[PDB]
Design an enzyme around this catalytic site. Sequence first.
Site, PDB file in Angstrom:
ATOM      1  N   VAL A  24      96.172  30.880  55.618  1.00 45.48           N
ATOM      2  CA  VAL A  24      97.467  31.570  55.702  1.00 45.48           C
ATOM      3  C   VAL A  24      98.240  31.507  54.352  1.00 45.48           C
ATOM      4  O   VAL A  24      99.217  32.230  54.166  1.00 45.48           O
ATOM      5  CB  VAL A  24      98.342  31.032  56.863  1.00 45.48           C
ATOM      6  CG1 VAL A  24      97.669  31.263  58.212  1.00 45.48           C
ATOM      7  CG2 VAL A  24      98.679  29.556  56.661  1.00 45.48           C
ATOM      8  N   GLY A  25      97.811  30.646  53.433  1.00 38.46           N
ATOM      9  CA  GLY A  25      98.458  30.505  52.144  1.00 38.46           C
ATOM     10  C   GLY A  25      97.503  30.158  51.021  1.00 38.46           C
ATOM     11  O   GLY A  25      96.587  29.366  51.192  1.00 38.46           O
ATOM     12  N   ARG A  26      97.751  30.719  49.845  1.00 40.75           N
ATOM     13  CA  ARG A  26      96.970  30.463  48.645  1.00 40.75           C
ATOM     14  C   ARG A  26      97.951  30.565  47.500  1.00 40.75           C
ATOM     15  O   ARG A  26      98.611  31.587  47.371  1.00 40.75           O
ATOM     16  CB  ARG A  26      95.868  31.524  48.480  1.00 40.75           C
ATOM     17  CG  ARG A  26      95.172  31.467  47.130  1.00 40.75           C
ATOM     18  CD  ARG A  26      94.288  30.251  47.046  1.00 40.75           C
ATOM     19  NE  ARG A  26      93.650  30.095  45.740  1.00 40.75           N
ATOM     20  CZ  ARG A  26      93.911  29.107  44.890  1.00 40.75           C
ATOM     21  NH1 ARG A  26      94.811  28.177  45.196  1.00 40.75           N
ATOM     22  NH2 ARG A  26      93.264  29.029  43.737  1.00 40.75           N
TER      23      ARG A  26
ATOM     24  N   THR B 206      99.554  27.915  43.754  1.00 39.19           N
ATOM     25  CA  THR B 206      99.313  26.775  42.846  1.00 39.19           C
ATOM     26  C   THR B 206      99.221  25.431  43.590  1.00 39.19           C
ATOM     27  O   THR B 206      98.707  24.455  43.049  1.00 39.19           O
ATOM     28  CB  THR B 206     100.341  26.745  41.720  1.00 39.19           C
ATOM     29  OG1 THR B 206     101.638  26.526  42.294  1.00 39.19           O
ATOM     30  CG2 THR B 206     100.323  28.030  40.885  1.00 39.19           C
TER      31      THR B 206
ATOM     32  N   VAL C 119      96.270  26.759  52.210  1.00 40.98           N
ATOM     33  CA  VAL C 119      96.814  26.283  53.480  1.00 40.98           C
ATOM     34  C   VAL C 119      96.164  27.052  54.594  1.00 40.98           C
ATOM     35  O   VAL C 119      96.116  28.275  54.553  1.00 40.98           O
ATOM     36  CB  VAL C 119      98.357  26.396  53.563  1.00 40.98           C
ATOM     37  CG1 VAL C 119      98.857  25.970  54.942  1.00 40.98           C
ATOM     38  CG2 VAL C 119      99.016  25.574  52.469  1.00 40.98           C
TER      39      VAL C 119
ATOM     40  N   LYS D  17      96.063  21.546  54.251  1.00 40.17           N
ATOM     41  CA  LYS D  17      96.144  21.989  52.877  1.00 40.17           C
ATOM     42  C   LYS D  17      95.060  21.384  52.043  1.00 40.17           C
ATOM     43  O   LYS D  17      94.956  20.180  52.006  1.00 40.17           O
ATOM     44  CB  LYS D  17      97.523  21.674  52.262  1.00 40.17           C
ATOM     45  CG  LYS D  17      97.617  22.112  50.805  1.00 40.17           C
ATOM     46  CD  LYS D  17      99.009  22.180  50.291  1.00 40.17           C
ATOM     47  CE  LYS D  17      99.659  20.831  50.229  1.00 40.17           C
ATOM     48  NZ  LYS D  17     100.854  20.901  49.372  1.00 40.17           N
TER      49      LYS D  17
ATOM     50  N   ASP E 250     111.537  23.011  43.110  1.00 36.99           N
ATOM     51  CA  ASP E 250     110.986  24.352  43.279  1.00 36.99           C
ATOM     52  C   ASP E 250     111.363  25.010  44.589  1.00 36.99           C
ATOM     53  O   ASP E 250     110.570  25.788  45.121  1.00 36.99           O
ATOM     54  CB  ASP E 250     109.463  24.330  43.085  1.00 36.99           C
ATOM     55  CG  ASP E 250     108.853  25.706  42.873  1.00 36.99           C
ATOM     56  OD1 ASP E 250     109.511  26.555  42.232  1.00 36.99           O
ATOM     57  OD2 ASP E 250     107.710  25.922  43.333  1.00 36.99           O
TER      58      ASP E 250
HETATM   59  C1  LIG Z   1     102.409  33.268  53.817  1.00 37.96           C
HETATM   60  O1  LIG Z   1     102.280  32.519  52.639  1.00 37.96           O
HETATM   61  C2  LIG Z   1     102.717  31.159  52.751  1.00 37.96           C
HETATM   62  C3  LIG Z   1     102.477  30.215  53.925  1.00 37.96           C
HETATM   63  C4  LIG Z   1     102.667  28.753  53.484  1.00 37.96           C
HETATM   64  C5  LIG Z   1     102.538  27.686  54.543  1.00 37.96           C
HETATM   65  C6  LIG Z   1     102.496  27.965  55.896  1.00 37.96           C
HETATM   66  C7  LIG Z   1     102.480  26.881  56.747  1.00 37.96           C
HETATM   67  N1  LIG Z   1     102.499  25.605  56.328  1.00 37.96           N
HETATM   68  C8  LIG Z   1     102.540  25.446  54.992  1.00 37.96           C
HETATM   69  N2  LIG Z   1     102.601  24.168  54.512  1.00 37.96           N
HETATM   70  C9  LIG Z   1     102.606  22.964  55.351  1.00 37.96           C
HETATM   71  C10 LIG Z   1     103.038  21.872  54.381  1.00 37.96           C
HETATM   72  C11 LIG Z   1     102.543  22.370  53.042  1.00 37.96           C
HETATM   73  F1  LIG Z   1     101.164  22.125  52.940  1.00 37.96           F
HETATM   74  C12 LIG Z   1     102.724  23.846  53.090  1.00 37.96           C
HETATM   75  N3  LIG Z   1     102.552  26.432  54.069  1.00 37.96           N
HETATM   76  C13 LIG Z   1     104.029  28.588  52.794  1.00 37.96           C
HETATM   77  N4  LIG Z   1     104.119  29.528  51.678  1.00 37.96           N
HETATM   78  C14 LIG Z   1     104.158  29.171  50.383  1.00 37.96           C
HETATM   79  O2  LIG Z   1     104.238  29.993  49.482  1.00 37.96           O
HETATM   80  C15 LIG Z   1     104.079  27.720  49.997  1.00 37.96           C
HETATM   81  C16 LIG Z   1     104.703  27.239  48.854  1.00 37.96           C
HETATM   82  N5  LIG Z   1     104.310  25.951  48.662  1.00 37.96           N
HETATM   83  C17 LIG Z   1     103.455  25.575  49.666  1.00 37.96           C
HETATM   84  C18 LIG Z   1     102.813  24.299  49.705  1.00 37.96           C
HETATM   85  N6  LIG Z   1     102.325  23.270  49.683  1.00 37.96           N
HETATM   86  C19 LIG Z   1     103.312  26.644  50.515  1.00 37.96           C
HETATM   87  C20 LIG Z   1     104.070  30.928  52.104  1.00 37.96           C
END
Ligand SMILES: CO[C@@H]1C[C@H](c2ccnc(N3CC[C@@H](F)C3)n2)CN(C(=O)c2c[nH]c(C#N)c2)C1
Lengths: 265, 335
Positions: B27-29, B31, B35, B52, B146
């Site tokens: 659901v996420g990619r 830096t 995720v 992650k 950030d």
């Molecule tokens: C739709 O795109 C994303 C979904 C990402 C998401 C969805 C659900 N859980 C998580 N996390 C649980 C705890 C951490 F591991 C992050 N992250 C969040 N987003 C990001 O940009 C992002 C920026 N930094 C982090 C980190 N680390 C993520 C948008």
Amino acid sequence: AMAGNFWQSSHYLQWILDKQDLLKERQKDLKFLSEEEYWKLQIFFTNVIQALGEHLKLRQQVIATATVYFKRFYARYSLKSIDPVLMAPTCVFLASKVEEFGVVSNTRLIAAATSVLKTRFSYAFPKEFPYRMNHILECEFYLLELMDCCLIVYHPYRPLLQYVQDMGQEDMLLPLAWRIVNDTYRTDLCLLYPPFMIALACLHVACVVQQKDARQWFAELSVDMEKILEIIRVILKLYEQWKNFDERKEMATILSKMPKPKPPP
Amino acid sequence: MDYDFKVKLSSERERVEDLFEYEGCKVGRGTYGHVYKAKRKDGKDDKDYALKQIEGTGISMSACREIALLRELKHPNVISLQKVFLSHADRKVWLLFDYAEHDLWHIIKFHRASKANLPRGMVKSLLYQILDGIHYLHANWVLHRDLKPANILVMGEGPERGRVKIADMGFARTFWYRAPELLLGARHYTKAIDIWAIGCIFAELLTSEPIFHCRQSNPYHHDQLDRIFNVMGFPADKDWEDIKKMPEHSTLMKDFRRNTYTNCSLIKYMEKHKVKPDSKAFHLLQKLLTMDPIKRITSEQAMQDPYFLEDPLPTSDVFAGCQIPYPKREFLTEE
Ligand SMILES: CO[C@@H]1C[C@H](c2ccnc(N3CC[C@@H](F)C3)n2)CN(C(=O)c2c[nH]c(C#N)c2)C1
Ligand SMILES: [Cl-]
């Protein structure tokens, strides 16, 4: 970072150990070494970490965190599990990242360990440091998981500065009390007591040494003075051991008695 | 390494690929790494998890800060670290959390796309919860560094419905959320930098638009500062006395003239976006969006603002029992 959070930290909740549990886990190493020789080895490796940190121009806080990681590792595991010669620079390398000092380069970390052991510890090590960066990286993974990923460590230096500032005796007592706090890393104290208690014991010994009357300041503290006296007795005992111990004459023999890692079949 | 020690550890070692089903569920990619929305393979829970895989191999400064800090931090508005898996063969680090179905980037994007084609206190509750989590971090001397809508997660259906979870402590050390002192060469991150980012988010929650929206090594960024002056106006000497002390102050003087932004103010900007300047919401936004960082409100002072005592009160569930209209997150086909 996390200052003030001691009573809710992993350092307090997981890494403030019961002396009997610690002594029980040590029994597996006490089959090869006497209690005295095991203590001398911990003094030795604290001095190795200190020298590695000095060579790499690391701040005392980085060195202290690395020392605690090393003690925490060998509090739960045997000296044979991983070579402490590899564990000591690995602890320094990880602490430098946690303390936001940076990633010590592969060449710099390997040259510093090779150089420190050669120029400062050849009485104990006849051969050159044999490990490479891949070994340090492997060890880092093991050290991280075997500490349950607990990286934030609390030290007696910050509470000590607050105490000597309160006393209004920084110029006279801080240099000596700070040095005594350095000395407490040659013992198991950081695994048994909260840092503010080790800082109070060091400050008390500094007052005794410098014949500074501070009974009223110490009495006005809402602290368990019996635990402070337990720490003071450990510090006084370290000075007697330090006096009777010649690390340069004894460490090559103690390191030979130490259990070594068993090779694969 | 002792062989017996090594095989015992390898036997007891929990592997992420054996515990969780996540392949195809990214659901996420970014830096931060990758995720995934994961499920337990042993099936003793039906909960969704967030897995992650930290960016790069080994323990980078970023991975180190994220693990070191989340291992200590415990607050309802900060994402909670459940487990760390260290994959020895590829040197990859995996972190486990609860899965937050929502984040402010998606919620805001949903409202923005609607205006093209919220419950009463949702924005207020989101802001209160962001302030509460940031205040906890700051009280513990932790700067986020950030903050942006994307790392402000919000729980979906379940026992923590509509609870903000601040994510990503891995910023170890676009610019729409960067305080102007950072754009003028400030050498350190401060609590005030996080507060400015919260102010950008608050304004964006009220209007659905990034307040300092701007086109795509040097800390100094002309267009980003220009967008800030177009919104806020150009700071007078009295507004930000220590602006002279910024490393890029003479570059700011050379590239900019005060009079260009003479009819520019936060009041006029928020007026265009139908937010009343006489409201408690506006007065709080202006205290968060103060150009001089030493004049920016603290997170604890923001939580005490009379805006949070005015009807409607912030709620534990930002959705306030209302049907969540926001769609579920889409799975990236990462190749
Ligand atoms: C739709 O795109 C994303 C979904 C990402 C998401 C969805 C659900 N859980 C998580 N996390 C649980 C705890 C951490 F591991 C992050 N992250 C969040 N987003 C990001 O940009 C992002 C920026 N930094 C982090 C980190 N680390 C993520 C948008
Ligand atoms: Cl201003």
